[PDB]
């Protein structure tokens, strides 16, 4: 069996797996009030991609396909292709096209289009609301709100690049996005299918450890916290190595590379998430000046040193 | 001594190291007419970063810092911080802040900003012309043209997210952007310093192999071809592995995973670029349905099988 290992990039050098932005810190705290069931950034330690997880760090929350204008509006329907411009088959055993956003919110970006007959191009500000009834990526159908009613052509390659998130209206601040609320991938009133399982700490005295970024804000007072279970580089590495899991739990160590100091301990679970010995109702934030180091296989009953 | 190896992800699954977009194909042809000296995606096989190359795949052509409004216009000057929000040190032996664009052109994107008191956010269309006289990233200053003259606060975290290239100089002309023309990093009428060296084929009967993407176009008729010398995932891998080079040339083989067939042979050079045995005046484009496999170190005298 090939020896298991973990990338030696520092957290500061790695990418969020749920939005194309760099990681900024670590986060642990109580998640009892939420169902922690993200679909992107899900991968087993022996290399099985789950949920809607694909391998490109920039193909996250991106959309590709062709667009159809909705008359009397500045809204466009995108008939979806897969992230590599293959036909999207709605019968594949996945919740949605790979890389589909896994949280409810209004994601702002740009719609770009190239006409293949002469290489003419255009770009427009666009917003997609993954909570709207017409958000149905599992059916191959997504609606975008743009600033034009005419400039986009049918049957031409179109790409959505995400930039950030917005909050609107006179409602409470940071009410939106809701990073732990999965969208209805098939539209209003449908059940999601083939989901990566929800995760929660099991051994008592432990809590989940999150790899956290801050989504750029484009308008309003949004909740820009975005926690992921594995860095996108870890997803790429486990898939490549596919090292057999000698046990259910890999013991990792957080090491500052300049001092060599060990700063805390944690458990990497075979199904692809991390728990630490952190307790209580407050949150603990950890600067990103460290890398993870695999030291030995253990079981779920190993007792971690509180961090 | 650690054995050398290259990631096993197919080209389709890897990211361009000169812009945050996926790789789409391989490209080889005569390039003696150009000076091939990109500063991003520059890394030796034992993991020494060169030029302005950093490790994040999403922090390429991004800028971070605070902005000062240029009165009487919709333009802003961004006083730069490093990509990790540290004070930029212009006395570092680098050509420009790590991740700076390494080509002359008009790059379109969005400027987002967060006010640290109340968490209010804002985003605006923005273009940076890397050929402009006030494009002086090495001095810590870059200028953006936006769509506002008021809605940006001073001394607040501001980020530029790139989306694509535009084109409004020679209109239908495919004369811009110019991917093999370095900016004047210190501004108009200055000379660049600490460049990663230019590359060219040395062995008779050989040409450079490029990892090619197509940049999104946002306006006009831009030249969207973008060739990098190494996938950003290879830069990441070499930096972590840091395996000693037993020879100046690693022999790789391009293999289609679905079949196991070798499609061609190539030399990976210690300094961080690839050459193949190909010598027409015609270009050759290769679909990205294959990965690279390190087979053995060889000398510069090795004769590759033609393609």
């Amino acid at each position: 069996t090939k020896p298991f290992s973990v990338p030696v990039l520092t957290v500061e050098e790695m990418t969020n797996s749920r939005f194309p932005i760099p990681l900024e810190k670590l986060f642990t705290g109580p998640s009892s009030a939420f169902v922690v069931q993200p679909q992107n950034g899900r991968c087993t330690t022996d290399g099985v991609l789950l949920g809607t997880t694909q391998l490109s760090p920039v193909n996250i929350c991106t959309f590709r396909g062709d667009v159809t204008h909705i008359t009397g509006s500045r809204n466009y329907t995108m008939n979806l292709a897969s992230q590599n411009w293959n036909d999207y088959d709605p019968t594949e055993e996945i919740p949605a096209p790979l890389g589909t956003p896994d949280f409810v919110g209004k994601i702002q970006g740009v719609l770009t289009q190239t006409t293949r007959t002469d290489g003419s191009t255009r770009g427009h500000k666009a917003t997609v609301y993954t909570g709207s009834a017409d958000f149905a990526p599992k059916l191959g159908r997504v609606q975008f709100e743009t600033d034009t009613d005419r400039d986009f052509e049918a049957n031409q390659n179109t790409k959505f690049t995400p930039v950030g998130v917005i909050q609107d209206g006179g409602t409470t601040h940071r009410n939106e996005p809701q990073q732990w609320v999965l969208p209805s991938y098939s539209g209003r009133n449908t059940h999601n299918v083939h989901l990566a399982p929800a995760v929660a700490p099991t051994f008592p005295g432990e809590q989940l450890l999150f790899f956290r970024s801050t989504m750029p804000g484009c308008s309003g007072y949004p909740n820009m916290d975005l926690d992921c279970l594995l860095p996108q580089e870890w997803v790429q590495y486990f898939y490549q190595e596919a090292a057999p899991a000698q046990s259910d739990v890999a013991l990792l160590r957080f090491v500052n590379p300049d001092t060599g100091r060990v700063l805390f301990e944690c458990k990497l679970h075979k199904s692809g998430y991390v728990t630490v010995a952190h307790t209580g109702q407050h949150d603990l934030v950890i600067p990103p000046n460290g890398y993870f180091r695999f030291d030995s296989w253990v079981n779920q009953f190993y007792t971690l040193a509180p961090m | 001594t650690k054995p050398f190896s290259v990631p096993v992800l197919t080209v389709e699954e890897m990211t361009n190291s000169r812009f945050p977009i996926p790789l789409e194909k391989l490209f080889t042809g005569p390039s003696s007419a150009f000076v091939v000296q990109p500063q991003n995606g520059r890394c030796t096989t034992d993991g020494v970063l060169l030029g302005t190359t950093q490790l994040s795949p999403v922090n390429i052509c991004t800028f971070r810092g605070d902005v000062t409004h240029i009165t009487g216009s919709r333009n802003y000057t961004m006083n730069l911080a490093s990509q990790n929000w540290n004070d930029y040190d212009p006395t570092e032996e680098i050509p420009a802040p790590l991740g700076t664009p390494d080509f002359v052109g008009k790059i379109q994107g969005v400027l987002t900003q967060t006010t640290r008191t109340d968490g209010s956010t804002r985003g605006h269309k923005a273009t940076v012309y890397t050929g402009s006289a006030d494009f002086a990233p090495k001095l810590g200053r870059v200028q953006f043209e936006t769509d506002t003259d008021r809605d940006f606060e001073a001394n607040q975290n501001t980020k530029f997210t790139p989306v694509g290239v535009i084109q409004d100089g020679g209109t239908t002309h495919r004369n811009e952007p110019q991917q093999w023309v370095l900016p004047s990093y210190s501004g108009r009428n200055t000379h660049n310093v600490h460049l990663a060296p230019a590359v060219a084929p040395t062995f008779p009967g050989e040409q450079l192999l490029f990892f090619r993407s197509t940049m999104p176009g946002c306006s006009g008729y831009p030249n969207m071809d973008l060739d990098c010398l190494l996938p950003q995932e290879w830069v990441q891998y070499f930096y972590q592995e840091a395996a000693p080079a037993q020879s100046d040339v690693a022999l790789l083989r391009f293999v289609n995973p679905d079949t196991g067939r070798v499609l061609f042979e190539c030399k990976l050079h210690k300094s961080g670029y690839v050459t193949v045995a190909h010598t027409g005046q015609h270009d050759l484009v290769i679909p990205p349905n294959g990965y690279f496999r390190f087979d053995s170190w060889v000398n510069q005298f090795y004769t590759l099988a033609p393609m």
Partner: nanobody
Amino acid sequence: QVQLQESGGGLVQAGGSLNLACVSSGRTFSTWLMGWFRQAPGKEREFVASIDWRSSSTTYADSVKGRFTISRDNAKNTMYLQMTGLKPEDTAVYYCASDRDHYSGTYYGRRFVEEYDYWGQGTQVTVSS
């Protein structure tokens, strides 16, 4: 989960010296960037000094450079501020603060108050002309 307690400092004549200390307690993490701030009645809180967890990078306000010295002892969970040449201008409450998001002593926003996430109740320094 975090309490910063600063001590030392009281009444000193113009020209004198003081030694402030700040002790960390609770669910803390050793890499947090930390600094000193001061606020006088009816005025705005202003930056004084900062230092990283490795004592690599020290930063001082222009109005205290040369006179003040920031120092950090992680094993004792204590930050220090040695003050000399005290003028009545330096009369204020002195607070120690800590930014859980950052570790670099060159973090470009290290002088902004709103970047720090944990604050002590402060110790009073009064310099008498």
